[PDB]
Amino acid sequence: EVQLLESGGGLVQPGGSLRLSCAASGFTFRYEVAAWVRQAPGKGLEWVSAISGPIPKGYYADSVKGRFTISRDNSKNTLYLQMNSLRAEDTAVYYCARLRADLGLYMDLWGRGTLVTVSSASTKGPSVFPLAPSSKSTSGGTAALGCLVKDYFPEPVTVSWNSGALTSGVHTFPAVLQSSGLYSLSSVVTVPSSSLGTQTYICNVNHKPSNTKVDKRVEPKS
Amino acid sequence: QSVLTQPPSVSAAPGQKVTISCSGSSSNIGNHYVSWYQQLPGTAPKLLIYDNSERTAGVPDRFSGSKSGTSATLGITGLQTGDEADYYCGTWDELTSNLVFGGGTKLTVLGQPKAAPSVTLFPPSSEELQANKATLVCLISDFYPGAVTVAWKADSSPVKAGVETTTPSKQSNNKYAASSYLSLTPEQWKSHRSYSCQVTHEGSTVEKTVAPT
Prior knowledge:
Shape of chain B: globular
Structural class of chain B: mainly beta
Number of helices of chain B: 2
Helix content of chain B: under 10%
Organism of A: Homo sapiens
Distance between the termini of chain A: 70 Å
Number of strands of chain B: 19
PDB class: protein binding
Largest sheet of chain B: 7 strands, mixed
Order of helices and strands of chain A: EEEEEEEEEEEEEEEEEEE
Strand content of chain B: over 45%
Entry title: Structure of arginase-2 in complex with the inhibitory human antigen-binding fragment Fab C0021158
Oligomer: part of a larger assembly
Strand content of chain A: over 45%
Keywords: arginase-2 inhibitor, IgG, protein binding
Shape of chain A: elongated
Number of helices of chain A: 0
Chain A: Fab C0021158 heavy chain (IgG1)
Radius of gyration of chain A: 25 Å
C-alpha cells in the first residue's frame, strides 16, 4: 500500500553526468522528507542527500556537496538525484528512502535500489600467468597448482585443463572487480603429489568479448 | 562509511538467540537515537527498530533494541532461517552533520557444521616478474558460515594498499569460497623476507606465508 521504485542507473565514464529517479506510490512524497543512501558493493551504507520542508531545501554529505543536486516533481510524485563530475569511488547501488522523525531520525521506507558503475574499462583481453605448485611438494597431502587470469573486461571468461580431459579437482574462483574497473580470477586444480615431472598440465583460457584464446604450461620451479 | 562499529558476522542454530553490538561516540550514539535495518540477499533494507527500541508494524518482540552510553545492541531470539540477512545500525552524527551507519553484520542460521577455511597462497610467477609486475593470490575455500576477514602482512607489518578481496560465494557442495589479491612492485616482493595471507573465520585465524626463493 506504499512503495518506492528507482530507475536511470547504469554505466557512465569518469567525469560524466547521470540523473536517477525514484517514483513513490500509495503516499504523497511531497509532504514527506526524502533521502538518497548508497552501498559500494560488499560494503556498508553511505547517506548522500536529503530534501525537506516546503521551499524546498537540500542537504548533502561533504563527499558529494557541489557535484550532486536533489530535487522532486510533485506532479509525477517522483524524487531525483542529479550527479555531476562522477568518480570511480561514486560506484555503488543507490537507494531512495523516506526520512521521518519522532524522538530521533529514521528511514521507514526504502526502494528496490539501482546500480551505478563509473569506469573507463574498454573490452580488454586478459594476461594469463602460471601458478606453479609449491616446491614443498609434501608426501602427505597433495599438490595445488593453478592459472592466474589478470585484468580483463567485461565478464565472462572460460577455463579448462588439458582441453577438457582434467576436471578431477578443478576449483575456478569467482572473479574480483578491481578499483581499476578490470576483472581478475584464478583457477587451481589439486592433482597427485607424484607424477608431476611426467604429467603436462595446460590451462586453456578463452575471453569472447576481446577475442582472446591462450594456453599456458604449468611446471614447478627449477 | 563505517563511523559506527559492528562485528562483521554472528551465527547461532535455529531457535537459538544472538545479539549484535553497535559502537559509536559522544556525538552520534552518545546523544542520538539508533535505528536497525535488515537487508535480505538481493533486497532493500527494511526498518526493524527506531528511537533505540520501537519496533515497526509486523516486527515481533524477539527482535529487541537497546542503548547505553555510546553503544547499542540488536537482540534476536528464536532464530529462523528467514532471519539470514545483513543488519545495519544508523543514527545522526553531530560532528560531521551526517546520517551515519555501521559496516553491517552478516547473520547465518547454522544448517551445517562450522567449517574453517582452506587457504592456498601463490607467489608471483617467474613470468609476471619479467613484465615488471607482482601478484600474490590467496584462494579461500570450504568455509561455512560465509563470512571471513582477510589481513595481508609484509614481514609482520600491516599492508593496506593494493588489496582486492571478493565477497564470499556459494560452492557446489554448499560451503563458501573467496579470493584475495595483493599487488606489489618486484622491488617490494624481493625486499621482504615473507608476505602472509591471514583469514579470520569465527574468531580463529588461518595463516599462509610465502618467501622470494
